[PDB]
Write a protein that binds this ligand. Structure first.
Ligand code: SF4
Ligand code: ZN
Ligand code: ZN
Lengths: 138, 698
């Protein structure tokens, strides 16, 4: 928004907004350049975005064209899990039923991750990610 | 008459041999020929073989075809005294063929079909687990209603009054009577409609004769079948629609999730084919013409439910907002746009099958549907179906930024029109194509490729009753050049032209109709004209078609024209050839005896659409920079020439400015080129010769 993009620099529109506003994937919070640079420059600490406590790491930033945090997280996790599963049980022979069932399972996993449920099934999905990565290494 | 009899023989031989014919009929004397030729051609074979599929461009031609068809019924019932199985079914507008919106709604909008779906859903819901039925229902599918038409003609107005008396609804009568294979009189926007042509194509059951009446705007109708402008507000309606879909997801996931799982199993087991094969009398959504699409085995989002469809739909509309927020000038290739979309997020080329199914699923799970959100979802759904399929000739274009606020627009450019018309040449044969505003008739074998025969008009007699002069010298020959630019130049010269219109209108005060290439000249001469004696002496009042035309305003202007000409007053009708209402009702002195044309017709250039279709037709037929400034203008001028011709018993005069008219043909090619001041005295003599030769030639 034009009124919130940094807890210290929330209204820089009349100060010539020439600085970008980075967002850490472990916070999903907007921080302007001159602030975040000092943040990870003085040490990996948390940002004070409305009392945020999640630690902001050095570098590992991203540019955002803004498609809501829900869809951005669903496409990041969607691409990551899509790379973990790779082309396993997909285009191996040409079947349509088992392929659509496996895609239904993957989309149900992404659904359980974007909903969180009760922080119990998502951990099993993480173990599934470690198992799929172990299968891709072999 | 022998002249029309020749066209009767041509229609006969083309119906008995050819599969399609390009017949050029004279304006004003060729409407009643095919109507009887088709019926007699059906009687000579055996009474019920092929049926009349008459297609017009307006509703006035539909009403004229209905009353002339009634003249055929009376004509065949007054000469033999034997009653036969009558035909004639009037398929008109939904708002004009319904009775309930005139009792409680009091509206004539395009949402009457939604209320009709509310009543139909009320009937289905009172026949299943339980609004009222409607006004009268449950008796519209019986044999008596199926026989009220073959025993007596009840089409349109007679059907409206007959339903108002017999307490019936005409919508289900017409819909149930499309399968009866009567004489259907519908427009071109129904034969090629990505929502209506499917059901009509499934009810007529093919095997008939199609009649393309006034087939000169076929390319315009095929163009109007696509091109939807995305103007930043559809993004907000798509956002609120996605939020409404999320709320509906919370509602169906809150308490009642069994029906969504059962219908989901119906999708996994029987797919879209079973979903559309089980539902009866349910509201449908848009589709890129399934008979032309030919895509079966529609999988429901790789076997997924609704939350994934609204998630990928939110990602899709957000990607659309991302593609609509760019610099200014940018053109898209529909394949490169789909590849870029795949680079942003994988969704494959199957969102078409994912829209046609999920929309029906949501419909099957919705009982209180919001109209704007569902409409926006249908728009995004159509955009998905047309970025997933149909790519040859299709060209996605982004409107440039010109202020940059009023700007984020995205329009899709349609494909080759031959593709859209194609199915009628497999469904049918002996399709007669008649038009009175086609000259030359070679741009239809060229553009739109199809094998056919060419028959030109062979009727031309009594040239003294059809005064056809043209004006070249306007006294200074300076307004004919300044009246050809897109933006007018030298306002004083335009004021002089308007003064020439005042002198010409004063010379011939007997009903004047003026056609303009655009409304810019009208709005420039109507602001401050320095003269008004024509309105104060001979015309009493002037008739101006608004640049934003209104139905009631145009109707009051036409009725005002008929009453003004029926009181011995007359009025100038400042209209645009490119505007609405092309007219076609004449055969009387109430219409303009003299018609004035401001130069030649012009199409708006400097547009991305004209350049896209320009290069497309350049690659197709290589008719670059030559036919788009003479063929379209020739049709637009012929629309004004057709109003002057109204039978040999009547006369008229049409003044065409600009010498460039000599570069194009015209109906009845008998034209003399002279000045306008001389044309004043020439018309002054014609207004007496036309009145003297009548009783002499009779
Ligand atoms: S049944 Fe007839 S009158 Fe009733 S809503 Fe439908 S079209 Fe209108
Ligand atoms: Zn800051
Ligand atoms: Zn944070």
């Amino acid at each position: 928004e034009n009124k919130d993009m940094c807890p210290i620099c929330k209204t820089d529109r009349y100060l010539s907004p020439d600085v970008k506003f980075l967002v850490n994937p472990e916070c999903y919070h907007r921080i302007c350049e001159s602030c975040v640079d000092r943040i990870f420059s003085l040490g990996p600490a948390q940002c004070p975005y409305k009392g945020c406590d999640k630690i902001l790491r050095k570098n590992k930033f991203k540019t955002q064209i803004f498609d809501d945090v829900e869809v951005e997280k669903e496409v990041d996790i969607r691409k990551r899990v899509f790379n973990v599963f790779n082309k396993t049980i997909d285009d191996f022979n040409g079947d349509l039923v088992e392929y659509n069932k496996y895609l239904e399972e993957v989309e149900d996993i992404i659904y359980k991750l974007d909903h969180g449920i009760d922080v119990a099934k998502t951990e099993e999905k993480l173990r599934t990610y470690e198992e799929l990565n172990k299968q891709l290494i072999m | 008459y022998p002249e029309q009899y020749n066209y009767m023989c041509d229609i006969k031989k083309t119906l008995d041999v050819g599969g399609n014919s390009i017949l050029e009929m004279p304006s004003g004397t060729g409407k009643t020929v095919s109507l009887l030729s088709l019926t007699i051609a059906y009687q000579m074979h055996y009474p019920e073989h092929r049926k009349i599929i008459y297609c017009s461009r307006t509703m006035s031609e539909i009403e004229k075809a209905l009353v002339e068809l009634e003249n055929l019924m009376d004509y065949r019932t007054k000469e033999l005294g034997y009653q036969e199985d009558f035909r004639g079914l009037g398929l008109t507008s939904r708002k004009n063929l319904c009775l309930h919106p005139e009792v409680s709604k009091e509206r004539k909008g395009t949402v009457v079909d939604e209320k009709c779906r509310r009543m139909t859903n009320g009937q289905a819901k009172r026949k299943l687990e339980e609004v009222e039925l409607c006004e009268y229902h449950e008796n519209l599918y019986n044999i008596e209603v199926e026989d009220y038409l073959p025993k007596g003609v009840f089409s349109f107005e007679k059907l409206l009054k007959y339903c108002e008396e017999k307490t019936l609804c005409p919508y289900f009568i017409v819909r149930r009577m499309i399968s009866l294979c009567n004489i259907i009189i519908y427009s071109y926007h129904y034969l090629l409609d990505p929502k209506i042509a499917e059901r009509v194509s499934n009810e007529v059951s093919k095997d008939s004769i199609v009649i393309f009446d006034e087939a000169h705007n076929i390319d315009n109708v095929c163009i109007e079948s696509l091109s939807l402008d995305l103007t930043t507000d559809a993004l907000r309606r798509a956002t609120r629609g996605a939020n409404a879909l999320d709320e509906r997801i919370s509602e169906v996931r809150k308490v009642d999730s069994q029906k969504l799982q059962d219908e989901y199993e119906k999708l996994v087991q029987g797919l879209x084919x079973x979903x559309x094969x089980x539902x009866x009398x349910x509201x449908x959504x848009x589709x890129x013409x399934x008979x032309x699409x030919x895509x079966x085995x529609x999988x429901x989002x790789x076997x997924x439910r609704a939350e994934h469809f609204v998630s990928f739909l939110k990602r899709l509309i957000e990607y659309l907002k991302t593609r609509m927020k760019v610099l200014h000038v940018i053109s898209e290739t529909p394949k490169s746009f789909l590849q870029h979309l795949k680079q942003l997020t994988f969704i494959e080329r199957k969102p078409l099958r994912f829209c046609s199914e999920r929309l029906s699923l949501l419909v099957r799970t919705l009982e209180v549907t919001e109209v704007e959100d569902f409409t926006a979802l249908k728009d995004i759904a159509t955009f998905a179906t047309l970025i997933s399929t149909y790519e040859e000739g299709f060209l996605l274009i982004i409107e440039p930024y010109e202020i940059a606020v009023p700007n984020p627009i995205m329009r899709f450019t349609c494909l080759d029109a031959s593709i859209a018309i194609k199915p009628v040449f497999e469904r049918f044969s002996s399709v007669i194509i008649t038009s009175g505003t086609i000259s030359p008739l070679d741009m239809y074998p060229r553009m739109l490729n199809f094998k056919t025969v060419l028959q030109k008009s062979y009727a031309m007699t009594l040239a003294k009753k059809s005064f056809l002069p043209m004006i070249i010298t306007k006294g200074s020959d300076q307004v004919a050049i300044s009246s050809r630019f897109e933006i007018r130049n030298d306002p004083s010269i335009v004021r002089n032209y308007g003064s020439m219109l005042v002198e010409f209108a004063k010379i011939t005060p007997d009903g004047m109709v003026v056609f303009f290439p655009s409304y810019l000249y009208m709005e420039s001469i109507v602001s401050m004209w320095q003269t008004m004696g024509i309105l104060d002496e001979v015309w009493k009042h002037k008739l101006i078609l608004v640049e934003t035309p209104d139905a009631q305003e145009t109707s009051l202007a036409l009725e005002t024209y008929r009453k003004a000409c029926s009181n011995g007053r007359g009025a100038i009708l400042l209209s645009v050839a490119r505007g609405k209402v092309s007219e076609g009702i004449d055969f009387d002195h109430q219409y303009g005896r003299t018609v004035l044309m401001i130069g030649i017709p012009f199409q708006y250039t400097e547009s991305r659409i004209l350049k896209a279709r320009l290069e497309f037709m350049r690659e197709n037929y290589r008719i670059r920079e030559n036919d788009f400034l003479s063929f379209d203008a020739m049709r637009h001028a012929a629309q004004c020439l057709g109003r002057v011709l109204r039978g040999k018993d009547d006369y008229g005069v049409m003044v065409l400015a600009d010498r460039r008219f000599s570069r194009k043909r015209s109906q009845l090619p008998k034209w003399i080129a002279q000045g306008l001041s001389d044309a004043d005295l020439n018309l002054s003599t014609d207004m007496a010769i036309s009145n003297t030769k009548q009783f002499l030639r009779t």
